[PDB]
Amino acid sequence: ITGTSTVGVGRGVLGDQKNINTTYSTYYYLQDNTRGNGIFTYDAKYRTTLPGSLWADADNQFFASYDAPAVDAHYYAGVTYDYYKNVHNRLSYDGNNAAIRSSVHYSQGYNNAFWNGSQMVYGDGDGQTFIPLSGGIDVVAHELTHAVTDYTAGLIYQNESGAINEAISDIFGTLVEFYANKNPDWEIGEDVYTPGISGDSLRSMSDPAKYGDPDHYSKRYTGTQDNGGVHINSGIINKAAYLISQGGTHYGVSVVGIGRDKLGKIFYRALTQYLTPTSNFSQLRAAAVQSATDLYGSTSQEVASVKQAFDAVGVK
Numbered sequence: 001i002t003g004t005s006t007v008g009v010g011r012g013v014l015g016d017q018k019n020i021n022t023t024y025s026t027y028y029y030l031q032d033n034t035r036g037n038g039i040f041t042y043d044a045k046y047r048t049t050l051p052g053s054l055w056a057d058a059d060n061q062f063f064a065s066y067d068a069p070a071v072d073a074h075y076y077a078g079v080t081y082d083y084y085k086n087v088h089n090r091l092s093y094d095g096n097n098a099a100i101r102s103s104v105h106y107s108q109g110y111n112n113a114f115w116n117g118s119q120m121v122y123g124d125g126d127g128q129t130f131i132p133l134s135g136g137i138d139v140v141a142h143e144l145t146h147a148v149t150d151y152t153a154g155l156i157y158q159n160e161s162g163a164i165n166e167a168i169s170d171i172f173g174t175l176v177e178f179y180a181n182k183n184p185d186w187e188i189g190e191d192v193y194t195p196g197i198s199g200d201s202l203r204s205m206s207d208p209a210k211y212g213d214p215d216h217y218s219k220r221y222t223g224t225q226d227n228g229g230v231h232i233n234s235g236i237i238n239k240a241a242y243l244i245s246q247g248g249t250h251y252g253v254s255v256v257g258i259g260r261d262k263l264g265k266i267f268y269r270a271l272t273q274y275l276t277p278t279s280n281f282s283q284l285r286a287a288a289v290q291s292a293t294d295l296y297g298s299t300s301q302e303v304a305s306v307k308q309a310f311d312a313v314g315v316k
């Protein structure tokens with residue numbers, strides 16, 4: 001819509017107050033004009049018709065429980081934008097300032113959120129498995145990273161390629177969570193998963209075995225479910241990414257940590273330059289060793305740490 005850019009105030013899913021960019025035209029719409037071609041949040045109104053109605057508010061205040069999923073979807077979409085722009089100099093997910101559109105209140109009791117190829121889609125959860133998933137910045141950035149992947153490497157969503165595809169979204173989903181720097185960690189979905197249970201999450205990058213996911217190539221899932229365990233085998237790469245950043249000893253392999261910033265630089269360059277739709281774990285290693293060589297030199301510590309981390313998880 002066409003209106004005056006305004007700044008509203010509201011509370012997200014977890015009750016945290018935050019400002020959001022709005023557009024005023026009789027009503028205050030969730031339309032952020034300060035980022036690329038805009039960020040738009042829509043109300044699906046408990047139906048599956050997308051995108052729905054552009055979220056309108058009467059007083060520019062978003063403190064109602066019904067607003068909370070829209071606030072976080074709108075706000076965190078902007079944080080993800082600020083991350084890729086400021087850190088990797090990428091304008092939106094496509095690199096050409098494409099508009100980031102999101103729909104909340106999708107269906108009823110929907111325990112999922114996903115990028116549909118054109119926009120984000122956030123369900124409200126059932127209240128026991130999930131609360132509104134937009135409340136998890138890592139989930140938001142996770143799914144928005146799938147768009148970046150599609151507009152670059154195009155990794156398929158099956159077998160090892162899909163595990164990489166999932167690991168890329170967990171890595172940058174976690175890096176965006178650190179970029180926001182409110183309650184960062186190396187878990188996924190902890191903020192919205194099982195509200196009645198504390199200290200758990202969907203999966204752990206620091207210790208994938210915590211939830212039965214593999215932390216080594218020899219333990220990779222080989223079945224047919226989950227498109228070949230894309231969410232399961234991703235732990236092997238998540239463990240590698242965690243070791244590259246924070247370092248540590250794993251299966252007797254010592255890894256020197258180089259930090260989160262370089263981890264993002266190494267993996268962002270590997271995704272945008274060297275990965276192909278059918279990249280496997282071994283080719284990802286080569287993609288990360290080449291990226292670190294470009295950025296820091298073949299003899300640099302960063303290249304060594306990358307090799308160490310993939311050696312630790314058994315990816316040669």
Ligand SMILES: O[C@@H]1[C@@H](O)[C@H](O)OC[C@H]1O
Pocket residue numbers: 185186206207246
């Ligand atoms: O999971 C924890 C990790 O986040 C921290 O960085 O180091 C100790 C681990 O227990």
Ligand SMILES: O[C@@H]1[C@@H](O)[C@H](O)OC[C@H]1O
Pocket residue numbers: 209210211212213
């Ligand atoms: O110790 C882990 C256990 O907590 C989990 O239930 O299943 C996988 C094991 O590695």
Ligand SMILES: O[C@@H]1[C@@H](O)[C@H](O)OC[C@H]1O
Pocket residue numbers: 216218251314
């Ligand atoms: O043979 C593998 C070993 O090299 C590694 O250290 O841990 C897992 C084993 O399967």
Ligand SMILES: O[C@@H]1[C@@H](O)[C@H](O)OC[C@H]1O
Pocket residue numbers: 158159160220221222223227228229233
């Ligand atoms: O069965 C596949 C396995 O061979 C590969 O190693 O990782 C993905 C699985 O789907």
Ligand SMILES: [Ca+2]
Pocket residue numbers: 057058059060061062063
């Ligand atoms: Ca209001």
Ligand SMILES: [Ca+2]
Pocket residue numbers: 138174177184185186187188189190
């Ligand atoms: Ca997290």
Ligand SMILES: [Ca+2]
Pocket residue numbers: 190192193194195196197198199200201
């Ligand atoms: Ca929980």
Ligand SMILES: [Zn+2]
Pocket residue numbers: 142143146165166169
């Ligand atoms: Zn994913």
Ligand SMILES: [Zn+2]
Pocket residue numbers: 177183184185190191
């Ligand atoms: Zn967190």
Ligand SMILES: [Zn+2]
Pocket residue numbers: 231
């Ligand atoms: Zn998923």
